[PDB]
Design a protein around this motif. Structure first.
Motif, PDB file in Angstrom:
ATOM      1  N   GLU A   1       0.762  -1.258   0.000  1.00  0.00           N
ATOM      2  CA  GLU A   1       0.000   0.000   0.000  1.00  0.00           C
ATOM      3  C   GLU A   1       0.792   1.308   0.000  1.00  0.00           C
ATOM      4  O   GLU A   1       0.655   2.113  -0.920  1.00  0.00           O
ATOM      5  CB  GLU A   1      -1.122  -0.043   1.039  1.00  0.00           C
ATOM      6  CG  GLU A   1      -0.733  -0.471   2.456  1.00  0.00           C
ATOM      7  CD  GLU A   1      -0.866   0.681   3.453  1.00  0.00           C
ATOM      8  OE1 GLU A   1       0.101   1.460   3.597  1.00  0.00           O
ATOM      9  OE2 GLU A   1      -1.979   0.888   3.983  1.00  0.00           O
ATOM     10  N   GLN A   2       1.451   1.590   1.120  1.00  0.00           N
ATOM     11  CA  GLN A   2       2.289   2.761   1.418  1.00  0.00           C
ATOM     12  C   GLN A   2       1.464   4.034   1.611  1.00  0.00           C
ATOM     13  O   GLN A   2       1.513   4.685   2.654  1.00  0.00           O
ATOM     14  CB  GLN A   2       3.475   2.929   0.465  1.00  0.00           C
ATOM     15  CG  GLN A   2       4.555   1.854   0.596  1.00  0.00           C
ATOM     16  CD  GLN A   2       4.243   0.516  -0.077  1.00  0.00           C
ATOM     17  OE1 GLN A   2       3.515   0.411  -1.064  1.00  0.00           O
ATOM     18  NE2 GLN A   2       4.881  -0.561   0.369  1.00  0.00           N
ATOM     19  N   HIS A   3       0.855   4.472   0.512  1.00  0.00           N
ATOM     20  CA  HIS A   3      -0.018   5.639   0.321  1.00  0.00           C
ATOM     21  C   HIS A   3       0.344   6.977   0.969  1.00  0.00           C
ATOM     22  O   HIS A   3      -0.526   7.699   1.454  1.00  0.00           O
ATOM     23  CB  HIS A   3      -1.488   5.279   0.546  1.00  0.00           C
ATOM     24  CG  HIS A   3      -1.800   4.950   2.007  1.00  0.00           C
ATOM     25  ND1 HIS A   3      -1.301   5.572   3.071  1.00  0.00           N
ATOM     26  CD2 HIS A   3      -2.168   3.736   2.402  1.00  0.00           C
ATOM     27  CE1 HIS A   3      -1.285   4.738   4.108  1.00  0.00           C
ATOM     28  NE2 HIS A   3      -1.794   3.589   3.671  1.00  0.00           N
ATOM     29  N   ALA A   4       1.631   7.194   1.229  1.00  0.00           N
ATOM     30  CA  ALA A   4       2.152   8.425   1.841  1.00  0.00           C
ATOM     31  C   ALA A   4       2.145   9.580   0.837  1.00  0.00           C
ATOM     32  O   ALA A   4       2.991  10.473   0.846  1.00  0.00           O
ATOM     33  CB  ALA A   4       3.562   8.060   2.309  1.00  0.00           C
ATOM     34  N   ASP A   5       1.083   9.605   0.037  1.00  0.00           N
ATOM     35  CA  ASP A   5       0.820  10.576  -1.035  1.00  0.00           C
ATOM     36  C   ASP A   5       0.269  11.914  -0.538  1.00  0.00           C
ATOM     37  O   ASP A   5      -0.554  11.928   0.377  1.00  0.00           O
ATOM     38  CB  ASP A   5      -0.125   9.846  -1.992  1.00  0.00           C
ATOM     39  CG  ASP A   5      -0.344  10.563  -3.326  1.00  0.00           C
ATOM     40  OD1 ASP A   5       0.238  10.132  -4.346  1.00  0.00           O
ATOM     41  OD2 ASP A   5      -1.136  11.529  -3.285  1.00  0.00           O
ATOM     42  N   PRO A   6       0.799  13.014  -1.066  1.00  0.00           N
ATOM     43  CA  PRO A   6       0.391  14.378  -0.700  1.00  0.00           C
ATOM     44  C   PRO A   6      -0.741  15.011  -1.511  1.00  0.00           C
ATOM     45  O   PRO A   6      -1.250  16.069  -1.148  1.00  0.00           O
ATOM     46  CB  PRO A   6       1.677  15.188  -0.880  1.00  0.00           C
ATOM     47  CG  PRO A   6       2.321  14.535  -2.106  1.00  0.00           C
ATOM     48  CD  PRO A   6       2.003  13.051  -1.909  1.00  0.00           C
ATOM     49  N   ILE A   7      -1.115  14.370  -2.615  1.00  0.00           N
ATOM     50  CA  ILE A   7      -2.172  14.813  -3.535  1.00  0.00           C
ATOM     51  C   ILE A   7      -3.552  14.252  -3.190  1.00  0.00           C
ATOM     52  O   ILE A   7      -4.551  14.834  -3.607  1.00  0.00           O
ATOM     53  CB  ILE A   7      -1.598  14.512  -4.921  1.00  0.00           C
ATOM     54  CG1 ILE A   7      -1.706  15.668  -5.917  1.00  0.00           C
ATOM     55  CG2 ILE A   7      -2.206  13.270  -5.575  1.00  0.00           C
ATOM     56  CD1 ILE A   7      -1.157  17.007  -5.416  1.00  0.00           C
ATOM     57  N   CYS A   8      -3.612  13.155  -2.440  1.00  0.00           N
ATOM     58  CA  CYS A   8      -4.899  12.552  -2.062  1.00  0.00           C
ATOM     59  C   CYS A   8      -5.834  13.558  -1.386  1.00  0.00           C
ATOM     60  O   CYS A   8      -5.804  13.791  -0.178  1.00  0.00           O
ATOM     61  CB  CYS A   8      -4.753  11.272  -1.237  1.00  0.00           C
ATOM     62  SG  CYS A   8      -5.545   9.922  -2.184  1.00  0.00           S
ATOM     63  N   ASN A   9      -6.894  13.676  -2.181  1.00  0.00           N
ATOM     64  CA  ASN A   9      -8.099  14.511  -2.059  1.00  0.00           C
ATOM     65  C   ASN A   9      -8.016  15.920  -2.646  1.00  0.00           C
ATOM     66  O   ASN A   9      -8.855  16.767  -2.342  1.00  0.00           O
ATOM     67  CB  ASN A   9      -8.700  14.499  -0.652  1.00  0.00           C
ATOM     68  CG  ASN A   9      -9.378  13.151  -0.404  1.00  0.00           C
ATOM     69  OD1 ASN A   9     -10.424  12.844  -0.973  1.00  0.00           O
ATOM     70  ND2 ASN A   9      -8.688  12.237   0.272  1.00  0.00           N
ATOM     71  N   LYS A  10      -6.988  16.186  -3.447  1.00  0.00           N
ATOM     72  CA  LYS A  10      -6.783  17.476  -4.120  1.00  0.00           C
ATOM     73  C   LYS A  10      -7.893  17.576  -5.168  1.00  0.00           C
ATOM     74  O   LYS A  10      -7.941  16.733  -6.063  1.00  0.00           O
ATOM     75  CB  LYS A  10      -5.372  17.619  -4.694  1.00  0.00           C
ATOM     76  CG  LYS A  10      -5.155  18.643  -5.810  1.00  0.00           C
ATOM     77  CD  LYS A  10      -5.457  20.088  -5.410  1.00  0.00           C
ATOM     78  CE  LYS A  10      -4.969  21.146  -6.401  1.00  0.00           C
ATOM     79  NZ  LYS A  10      -5.635  21.163  -7.711  1.00  0.00           N
ATOM     80  N   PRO A  11      -8.688  18.642  -5.129  1.00  0.00           N
ATOM     81  CA  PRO A  11      -9.781  18.798  -6.101  1.00  0.00           C
ATOM     82  C   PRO A  11      -9.237  19.278  -7.449  1.00  0.00           C
ATOM     83  O   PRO A  11      -8.395  20.169  -7.543  1.00  0.00           O
ATOM     84  CB  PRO A  11     -10.710  19.852  -5.495  1.00  0.00           C
ATOM     85  CG  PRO A  11     -10.491  19.685  -3.990  1.00  0.00           C
ATOM     86  CD  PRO A  11      -8.998  19.362  -3.886  1.00  0.00           C
ATOM     87  N   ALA A  31     -15.726  12.052  -6.767  1.00  0.00           N
ATOM     88  CA  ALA A  31     -14.948  12.705  -5.705  1.00  0.00           C
ATOM     89  C   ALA A  31     -14.316  14.013  -6.185  1.00  0.00           C
ATOM     90  O   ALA A  31     -14.392  15.002  -5.457  1.00  0.00           O
ATOM     91  CB  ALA A  31     -13.853  11.747  -5.232  1.00  0.00           C
ATOM     92  N   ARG A  32     -14.012  14.093  -7.478  1.00  0.00           N
ATOM     93  CA  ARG A  32     -13.395  15.244  -8.150  1.00  0.00           C
ATOM     94  C   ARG A  32     -12.079  15.623  -7.468  1.00  0.00           C
ATOM     95  O   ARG A  32     -11.661  16.780  -7.426  1.00  0.00           O
ATOM     96  CB  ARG A  32     -14.331  16.455  -8.184  1.00  0.00           C
ATOM     97  CG  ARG A  32     -15.642  16.230  -8.940  1.00  0.00           C
ATOM     98  CD  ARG A  32     -16.772  16.991  -8.246  1.00  0.00           C
ATOM     99  NE  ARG A  32     -17.061  16.338  -6.961  1.00  0.00           N
ATOM    100  CZ  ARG A  32     -16.909  16.840  -5.729  1.00  0.00           C
ATOM    101  NH1 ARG A  32     -16.200  17.954  -5.498  1.00  0.00           N
ATOM    102  NH2 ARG A  32     -17.310  16.104  -4.682  1.00  0.00           N
TER     103      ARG A  32
END
Length: 39
Positions: A1-11, A31-32
């Motif tokens: 998984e990892q998912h240490a992403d900074p863009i998650c939920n950026k519209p 979700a856009r």
């Protein structure tokens, strides 16, 4: 998984807006926001 992403939920609408992403590289429909790149 990892998912240490900074863009998650950026519209946005496209995945290109989530350009610097690695995980949430695809901007989802309902979700856009910068969700996982499905793959």
């Amino acid at each position: 998984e990892q998912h240490a992403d900074p863009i998650c939920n950026k519209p946005c609408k496209t995945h290109d807006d989530c350009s610097g992403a690695w995980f949430c590289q695809a901007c989802w429909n309902s979700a856009r926001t910068c969700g996982p790149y499905v793959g």
